Amino acid sequence: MLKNGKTEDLGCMYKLFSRVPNGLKTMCECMSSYLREQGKALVSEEGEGKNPVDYIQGLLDLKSRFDRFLLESFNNDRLFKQTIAGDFEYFLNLN
Protein backbone atom coordinates (compact mmCIF):
# COMPACT_ATOMS: atom_id res chain seq x y z
CA MET A 1 0.00 0.00 0.00
CA LEU A 2 2.97 2.31 -0.39
CA LYS A 3 2.22 1.69 -4.09
CA ASN A 4 -1.57 1.26 -3.77
CA GLY A 5 -1.96 4.48 -1.78
CA LYS A 6 -4.21 3.05 0.94
CA THR A 7 -3.44 5.63 3.62
CA GLU A 8 -5.54 4.04 6.38
CA ASP A 9 -3.27 0.98 6.44
CA LEU A 10 -0.19 3.22 6.51
CA GLY A 11 -1.71 5.21 9.37
CA CYS A 12 -2.52 2.10 11.41
CA MET A 13 0.96 0.66 10.77
CA TYR A 14 2.56 3.94 11.83
CA LYS A 15 0.36 4.01 14.94
CA LEU A 16 1.67 0.54 15.77
CA PHE A 17 5.32 1.28 15.05
CA SER A 18 5.69 4.75 16.58
CA ARG A 19 5.52 3.02 19.98
CA VAL A 20 9.20 2.00 19.86
CA PRO A 21 12.24 3.91 18.53
CA ASN A 22 14.22 2.33 15.66
CA GLY A 23 10.89 0.94 14.42
CA LEU A 24 10.21 4.17 12.58
CA LYS A 25 13.84 4.01 11.40
CA THR A 26 13.13 0.89 9.32
CA MET A 27 10.04 2.73 8.09
CA CYS A 28 12.31 5.59 6.99
CA GLU A 29 14.65 3.14 5.27
CA CYS A 30 11.87 1.45 3.29
CA MET A 31 10.18 4.77 2.46
CA SER A 32 13.40 6.40 1.26
CA SER A 33 14.39 3.29 -0.71
CA TYR A 34 11.05 3.25 -2.52
CA LEU A 35 11.32 7.00 -3.14
CA ARG A 36 14.87 6.76 -4.51
CA GLU A 37 14.03 3.77 -6.71
CA GLN A 38 11.00 5.45 -8.27
CA GLY A 39 12.68 8.85 -8.57
CA LYS A 40 15.79 7.48 -10.27
CA ALA A 41 13.50 5.47 -12.54
CA LEU A 42 11.66 8.62 -13.63
CA VAL A 43 14.20 11.46 -13.68
CA SER A 44 16.69 9.26 -15.57
CA GLU A 45 16.23 7.41 -18.85
CA GLU A 46 12.94 5.56 -19.39
CA GLY A 47 14.16 3.28 -22.17
CA GLU A 48 14.41 5.61 -25.16
CA GLY A 49 13.88 9.28 -24.38
CA LYS A 50 11.88 10.72 -21.51
CA ASN A 51 8.22 11.58 -20.98
CA PRO A 52 7.89 15.18 -19.71
CA VAL A 53 4.60 14.26 -18.01
CA ASP A 54 6.45 11.78 -15.76
CA TYR A 55 9.89 13.44 -15.87
CA ILE A 56 9.57 17.18 -15.25
CA GLN A 57 6.28 17.14 -13.33
CA GLY A 58 6.02 13.39 -12.71
CA LEU A 59 8.77 13.95 -10.17
CA LEU A 60 6.42 16.48 -8.59
CA ASP A 61 3.51 14.02 -8.90
CA LEU A 62 5.42 11.38 -6.93
CA LYS A 63 6.68 14.02 -4.49
CA SER A 64 3.07 15.08 -3.87
CA ARG A 65 2.00 11.45 -3.39
CA PHE A 66 4.79 10.97 -0.86
CA ASP A 67 3.90 14.13 1.01
CA ARG A 68 0.35 12.76 1.16
CA PHE A 69 1.86 9.63 2.72
CA LEU A 70 3.84 11.85 5.11
CA LEU A 71 0.78 13.89 6.12
CA GLU A 72 -2.22 11.56 6.25
CA SER A 73 -0.36 8.63 7.82
CA PHE A 74 3.06 9.77 9.10
CA ASN A 75 1.90 13.10 10.61
CA ASN A 76 4.97 14.93 9.21
CA ASP A 77 7.75 13.34 11.25
CA ARG A 78 10.98 15.32 11.09
CA LEU A 79 13.22 12.36 10.19
CA PHE A 80 10.97 11.14 7.37
CA LYS A 81 10.81 14.69 6.03
CA GLN A 82 14.60 15.08 6.17
CA THR A 83 15.21 11.80 4.33
CA ILE A 84 12.67 12.64 1.62
CA ALA A 85 14.09 16.17 1.25
CA GLY A 86 17.56 14.68 0.83
CA ASP A 87 16.23 12.25 -1.78
CA PHE A 88 14.56 15.12 -3.66
CA GLU A 89 17.70 17.25 -3.61
CA TYR A 90 19.83 14.30 -4.74
CA PHE A 91 17.82 13.01 -7.68
CA LEU A 92 16.68 16.48 -8.73
CA ASN A 93 20.26 17.10 -9.91
CA LEU A 94 20.19 13.93 -12.05
CA ASN A 95 17.76 15.41 -14.59
Helix, strand, coil shares of the chain, percent, nearest 5, are: 70, 0, 30
- DSSP letters spanning 33-60: HHHHHHHHHHHS--SSS--HHHHTSHHH
Cβ-in-10-Å burial (0-12, 13-18, 19+) of 87 comes to: buried
Q: Tell me how far CA of residue 78 lies from CA of 9, 49, 54, 87, in angstroms.
A: 21, 36, 27, 14
Under 8 Å between Cβ of 94 and 80: no
- State whether residue 24 is helix, strand or coil: helix
Note the resolution in Å, 1 decimal. 3.8
**Residues ≥6 apart with Cβ < 8 Å to 64:** none
Q: Taking CA 12 as the corner, what is the angle to CA 6 and CA 18, rounded to the nearest 5 degrees? A: 130
Cα–Cα distance between 17 and 46 in angstroms, integer? Answer: 36
- State whether residue 63 is helix, strand or coil: helix
